[PDB]
């Protein structure tokens, strides 16, 4: 999908950053505490001159290799003398987004953590980074997950790894085997444990941590805020473009191990054991080459979209994470009653801009939108004349011309997979608390002078709108930004963002006075008589304004007005 003179911009630009980096590395190094012995991490310089000191590939579990590989993770072997902290760790085993070819290694259970003073005079808001990239891609490394912005506040910050794809994400039916599913958010509870337990040796306050997350990052997130596994670990949480009952969020993958097995060599029968057997034994590259080819051609046609990441787990174990489908867990669930913020970008769907034009067909789903109907509301066949109404209705909403078009179809893109499911878990999340606040932000400021790879990802250069993944500039430094004027739209947005952030997970209100451009906001959290959500529209100016989406969004709740029990 990316193009031969991107992948050599790319490449220059890895080696320009490497160099970088070693400008910004000074000679001080520093010593600190955790629970399995002492870690030694390094002061950082960045762009704009501001320092930090920096511990990266600090453990949190074994690695999950032999015996552990699709395990839960176990807790970590302790060590005499200083573990080096100073450089980076493996990412989990995936497919590189730019060059295409398998990277990382299964030892990948590591967080790093970031604050500019070791020793502060008050115990600091400890803000915790999940990134995205679907359950497949993702990692915790500086050239994409800088801390060089929150640095310049005092938080600490830590960015976690955990695993991803079939190595984090397999899932099987049989007890006796112990593989019940999601050992990747199992890490993720892991890693959240490990913070309440070691963050003070940082200058962090235990009882306030902040959990954020992009993406499937945001889908993370918020299981952490639904499984009882995490209950009290953490204060607040903030959703960005995304949530644990997005369609794409989870699936039910336990008859797909041995479809994978059987992509990889294995010569057998379908039974648990034996598939698991050969698995243990496989190449990690394999299985992780091969994921893309596992769904069938029916879960293809039942627009499954990835073959594995969270699923119900068939069993209960210690360690479980999700005993029933996430829509269920809302009902009981302990991050109800925390601050919560949640938010979206102004042309989610923007992010399908290469795809449609690899693949212009795609309009002709326009046609009847019968494949947008969400499934627990679609016939079979998706052929009924009531399904045919409920298209019908989403047409309406998207289509706006004679023809539907390329951009009617990212419009649609952004209300199925972002808009929609976050509606949808408000009304839900209202019945199950207390009052508990719940603020919207809409991130709606375009920019190409600030970038990140998500960008050449989406081959969107010169692309206006604010797709997908383009709000990631403002918060992390990355390998392809640059220094920005401290007068430029783009340098007042970082402060702008990382400062709402920092406010939110200081107090659980993301207003402050102090912020730039946000003296004259009056932030209300969403109540359940409201009809119309209002939220912080972030552009070159901060407004409160009516989501511009709710339009659209109140089409998408009428498709259930005569299945309300459905919504």
């Known amino acids: 999908n990316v193009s031969l003179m991107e992948k050599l911009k790319w490449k220059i630009k890895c080696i320009e ?3 970088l980096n070693y400008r910004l590395t000074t000679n001080e190094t520093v010593v600190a505490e955790t629970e399995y012995g002492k870690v030694k991490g390094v002061k ?33 072997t302790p060590w005499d003398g200083v573990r080096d902290c100073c450089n980076h760790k493996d990412k989990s085993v995936q497919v590189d987004f730019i060059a295409g070819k398998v990277c990382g290694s299964e030892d990948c259970l590591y967080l790093s953590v970031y604050t500019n003073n070791l020793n502060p005079e008050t115990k600091r808001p400890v803000l915790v980074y999940i990134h995205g990239g ?11 997950y800088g801390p060089d912005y929150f640095i310049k506040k005092d938080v600490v910050l830590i960015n976690i790894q955990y695993r991803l794809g079939a190595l984090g994400f397999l899932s099987l039916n049989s007890e006796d085997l112990n593989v019940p599913g999601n050992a ?22 235990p009882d306030n941590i902040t959990v954020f997350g992009e993406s499937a990052g945001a889908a993370s997130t918020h299981y952490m805020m639904l499984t009882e596994q995490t209950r009290g670990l953490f204060h607040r949480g903030i959703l960005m473009s995304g949530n644990a009952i997005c369609p794409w969020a989870n699936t039910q993958c336990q008859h797909r191990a041995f479809t994978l097995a059987k992509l990889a060599g294995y010569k057998g029968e379908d039974n648990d054991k034996d598939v698991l057997e050969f698995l243990m034994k496989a190449k990690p590259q394999d299985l992780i080459k091969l994921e893309e080819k596992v769904l069938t051609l029916e879960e293809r046609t039942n627009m499954v979209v990835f073959p594995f990441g969270p699923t119900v787990e068939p069993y209960q174990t210690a360690d479980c994470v999700l005993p029933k489908h996430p829509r269920e867990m809302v009902k009981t669930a302990w991050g109800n009653s925390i601050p919560t913020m949640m938010g979206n970008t102004s042309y989610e769907g923007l992010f399908f801009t290469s795809i449609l034009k690899q693949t212009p067909m795609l309009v002709k789903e326009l046609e009847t939108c019968v ?46 997979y972002f808009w929609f499911p976050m509606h949808r878990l408000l009304q839900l999340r209202f019945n199950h608390t207390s009052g508990t606040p719940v603020y919207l932000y809409r991130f709606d400021f375009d920019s190409e002078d600030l970038i990140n790879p998500y960008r050449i990802m989406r081959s969107g250069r010169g692309v206006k709108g604010v797709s997908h993944a383009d709000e990631l500039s403002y918060f992390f430094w990355n390998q392809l930004a640059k220094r920005m ?28 006075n102090e912020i730039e451009g946000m003296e004259n906001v009056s932030w209300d959290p969403i109540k359940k008589s409201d009809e119309v959500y209002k939220c912080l529209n972030i552009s070159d100016e901060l407004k409160m304004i009516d989501v511009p989406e709710m339009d659209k969004i109140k089409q998408w709740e009428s498709m259930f007005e005569k299945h309300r029990d459905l919504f």
């Not at 999950?64 to 807790?75: I, N, S, T």
């Not at 019908?392 to 209300?415: Q, R």
């Not at 709402?500 to 209100?509: D, S, V, Y």
């Open 485 to 512: 004027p401290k007068e430029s739209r783009e340098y007042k947005t970082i402060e702008r963002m990382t400062g709402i952030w920092i406010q939110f997970a200081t107090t659980g209100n993301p207003y402050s």
């Open 184 to 205: 990747g958010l199992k890490d993720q509870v892991m890693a959240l444990r490990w913070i309440k337990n070691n963050c003070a040796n940082f200058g962090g306050n």
């Open 371 to 416: 494949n947008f109907v969400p499934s627990e509301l679609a016939d079979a066949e998706r052929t009924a004349p009531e399904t045919l109404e409920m298209g019908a209705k989403i047409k309406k909403a998207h289509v706006t011309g004679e023809t539907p078009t390329a951009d009617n179809f990212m419009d649609l893109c952004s209300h199925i």
């Open 134 to 144: 679907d359950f497949i891609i993702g990692e915790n490394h500086r050239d994409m």
């Open 44 to 76: 950082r310089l960045t762009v704009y001159d501001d320092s930090y000191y920096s511990f990266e590939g600090i453990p949190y579990a074994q690695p999950p290799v032999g015996e552990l590989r699709f395990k839960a993770p176990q807790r970590p």
């Open 17 to 19: 950053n490497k160099f």
